[PDB]
């Protein structure tokens, strides 16, 4: 079928990117593995195991 995980958007308030970690509120939820990362930051964040 497809091994592509679907990401979602989230922005609480006091949350920080789990990749570059900076002043902002950007987060993405990856299923199959369950991870959090900037709106994208794919260049920094690793590959969804
Ligand atoms: Zn980031
Ligand atoms: Zn995943």
UniProtKB/Swiss-Prot annotation:
It comes from the Eukaryota. Phosphorylated KSR1 is cytoplasmic and dephosphorylated KSR1 is membrane-associated. Zn(2+) 1 binds at residues 5, 30, 33, 48. It is found in: Cytoplasm; Membrane; Cell membrane; Cell projection, Ruffle membrane. Disulfide bonds: none annotated. A zinc finger (Phorbol-ester/DAG-type) spans 4-48. Homodimer. Heterodimerizes (via N-terminus) with BRAF (via N-terminus) in a MAP2K1/MEK1 or MAP2K2/MEK2-dependent manner. Interacts with MAP2K1/MEK1 and MAP2K2/MEK2. Binding to MAP2K1/MEK1 releases the intramolecular inhibitory interaction between KSR1 N-terminus and kinase domains which is required for the subsequent RSK1 dimerization with BRAF. Identified in a complex with AKAP13, MAP2K1 and BRAF. Interacts with AKAP13 and BRAF. Interacts with RAF and MAPK/ERK, in a Ras-dependent manner. Interacts with 14-3-3 proteins including YWHAB. Interacts with HSP90AA1/HSP90, YWHAE/14-3-3 and CDC37. Belongs to the protein kinase superfamily. TKL Ser/Thr protein kinase family. This is Kinase suppressor of Ras 1.
